[PDB]
Amino acid sequence: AVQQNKPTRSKRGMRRSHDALTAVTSLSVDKTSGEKHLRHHITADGYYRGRKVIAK
Amino acid sequence: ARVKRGVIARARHKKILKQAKGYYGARSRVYRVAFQAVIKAGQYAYRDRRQRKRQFRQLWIARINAAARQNGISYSKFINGLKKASVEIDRKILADIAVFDKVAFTALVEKAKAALA
């Protein structure tokens, strides 16, 4: 249920070795607007694959 | 005459932790663990001041045996022959000669063989 011995800094770090975050590999550039966006996601201005399909 | 203990306690703890430098984890960081690590290190150092002499005698004897068997005689026969010939060269210098001057070791072996024969 509970420890008998305090685990160490070392074992803490080894357990945390798989906690690293994977940064975004590469952002896609819009062909019309040239904005950077996540692939298959629309741009902040509302573009996607060169077309402005967003009301705003 | 109230006496505060901060300065002297810090001095003693820093002394022990300074001796505990290089150890692993709490042995190097925490005073309670470090103190019985430092005492254990001193006990081992006392013991190994004695054990060092045994280990080096063992090493010299092994090297002398190797060189003697190279020259065609056992270690026991070689030392007995040196004793009969009254050669008082110790085993440290015999091992040094075995490593660094093989001609001299052959000379010593022939002296021991003459002593035995």
Partner: protein, 110 residues
């Protein structure tokens, strides 16, 4: 010419902000600003403000470089934690620590 930016007493544990600080250490500011924008973490909103401040500080206090800047140092230090009481079953009070962190970013062209 190093330029510092500091956010002290951020409402986020150092362990939480360090996962994001690990993503932009030794990296071009333009590249570091893109990574932060697309990482679904609350630490990244907090770390993108210190980085942006540091660029602005490099613009205004130091010489106008911007394009030649890199994240030369970044670290997170534990800050003062706040102590609160969480009641539990059968009348036992637990102490919850609300942790804080100081974020430091250092940018230089060299």
């Amino acid at each position: 010419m190093e330029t510092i930016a500091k956010h002290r007493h951020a409402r986020s544990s150092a362990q939480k902000v360090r996962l994001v600080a690990d993503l932009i250490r030794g990296k071009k500011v333009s590249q570091a600003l893109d990574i932060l924008t697309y990482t679904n973490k609350k630490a990244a909103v907090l770390v993108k403000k210190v980085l942006e401040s540091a660029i602005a500080n490099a613009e205004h206090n130091d010489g106008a470089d911007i394009d030649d800047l890199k994240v030369t140092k970044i670290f997170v230090d534990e800050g003062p934690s706040m102590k609160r009481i969480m009641p539990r079953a059968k009348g036992r009070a637990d102490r919850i620590l609300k942790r804080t962190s100081h974020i430091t970013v250092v940018v230089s062209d060299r």
